[PDB]
Every structure is written in C-alpha cells, then in structure tokens.
C-alpha cells in the first residue's frame, strides 16, 4: 500500500466496509497507519471495526474447531488422524498473525504518538483486546505473560479514562465491558468482572442527566451490554 495515497486508503476502507470486505478494509487501514500520520477519531474507528471483524471470524472458526477437537479427545471417540489438530493449529496461527499485526501497528508507532486521552485510551483498549484474543488460544509458558500484557494495557487505559473522561463516554464504557469480560473469561475472576460491570453501569447512570439526546442514546446502548452481561452472570 506504500504507493497509494492516504486519503485514497481511507476512502477505499469506507467502500470496503460498505461491501462487507473486512480483510480489504484491514489492509487499507494498515497502509493508512503505515503512512506515519496520527489518526482521527473516525479513522481509529475504521481501523478497529476492520480488524475486529477479521479476528471475529477467525475466533469463531477457532472455537468451532476447538470444540470438535475436544470431542475427538473424549472417551469413546474414534481416532481420526491429525487432521482436526492440524487445521485448528493453522487457523490459530493465522489468528495469531492478525493479532501480531495489530499489536505491531500499536507499537510502531500509534500508542507513543497519542497524547490526547481519547486516542490513547482507544489504543490501549485495542492493545488489551488483542492480547486477550491471544490469551484465548494460548496454552503454555508465555500464557501468563500474555495475560499480564492484556491486564496491563487494560489497567493503564482504565486509569487514564477515570482521570480524563466522563463516566458516560462510550470508549470508557466499552473498555470497562471488555475488561470485565477479561476478568470473567481469562483471569478467572468472576466477582471482579461483576463488580466492575455494576460499578461502571451505576456511575454512568448517575451522569446520564448531563447528556444530550444522541449522547444519551450512544451511552445507553453500551450500558445495555453491561446489563446483558450482568443478567447472564447473576
């Protein structure tokens, strides 16, 4: 993408979103990042949407194959060869490559050039998310360091967002939702997850009165995700 203009890459990423071609969208946004300039709010959201749909497809595939593999590893299952394991490993390697790509973009050099609280919290939330995606498939030795990388990114984002953003900010709400999911699914801390979700919901509820109608809609939509997770876990 080094020969295409930055504006053209953004425009084509938008076209790809409209056509539901998220691999193309991700490659376009990667080229845009590689142009070296800081991203706007809209461009950050495009990058996140693109890589989120790519990894989402790969993670769903991984879960399907992992469940097939673990049923093939039960008592009474007929030996089928190494095919399921090999294909699960291939999908896993591809997922890991996508996460490594995102984290390399964040490290060179999105995070270190983000001074504003909104952009920095956004990038650290992404970092925590993609280390969490790596942690979902990790099995040995580096597992604990991957988990702590996710925890560290999430924690720094939480600190900055508590200091510099209102409790109704959608980025803060989504960050708290994802950090609670990390606590529940990854860190084996369901009480921390529930506590975080209820505290975030309540403090945003208390400040809903300051918001305009559209900001109100934006914040309540994510508070509903928090309430969904709470209803599932309680």
């Amino acid at each position: 993408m080094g020969s295409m203009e930055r504006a053209s890459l953004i425009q084509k990423a938008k076209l790809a979103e409209q056509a539901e071609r998220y691999e193309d969208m991700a490659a376009f946004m990667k080229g845009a990042v590689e142009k070296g300039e800081e991203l706007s709010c809209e461009e950050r959201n495009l990058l996140s949407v693109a890589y989120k749909n790519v990894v989402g497809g790969q993670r769903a595939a991984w879960r399907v194959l992992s469940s097939i593999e673990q049923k093939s590893n039960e008592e009474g299952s007929e030996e089928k060869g190494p095919e399921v394991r090999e294909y699960r490993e291939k999908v896993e390697t591809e997922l890991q490559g996508v996460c490594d790509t995102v984290l390399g973009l964040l490290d060179s050099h999105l995070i270190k050039e983000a001074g504003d609280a909104e952009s920095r919290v956004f990038y650290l939330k992404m970092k925590g998310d993609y280390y969490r995606y790596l942690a979902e498939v990790a099995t040995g030795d580096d597992k604990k360091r991957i988990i702590d990388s996710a925890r560290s990114a999430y924690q720094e984002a939480m600190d900055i967002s508590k200091k510099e953003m209102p409790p109704t900010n959608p980025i803060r709400l989504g960050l708290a939702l994802n950090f609670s999911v990390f606590h529940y699914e990854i860190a084996n801390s369901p009480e921390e997850a529930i506590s975080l979700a209820k505290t975030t919901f309540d403090e945003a509820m208390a400040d809903l009165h300051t918001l305009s109608e559209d900001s109100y809609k934006d914040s309540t939509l994510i508070m509903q995700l928090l309430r969904d997770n709470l209803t599932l876990w309680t």
Binding site: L177, N178, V181, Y184, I222, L225, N229
Partner: peptide, 5 residues
C-alpha cells in the same frame, strides 16, 4: 454469549 466491544 457475553457481550464485548
């Protein structure tokens, strides 16, 4: 399935 963002 639990919600994430």
């Amino acid at each position: 399935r639990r919600m994430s963002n």
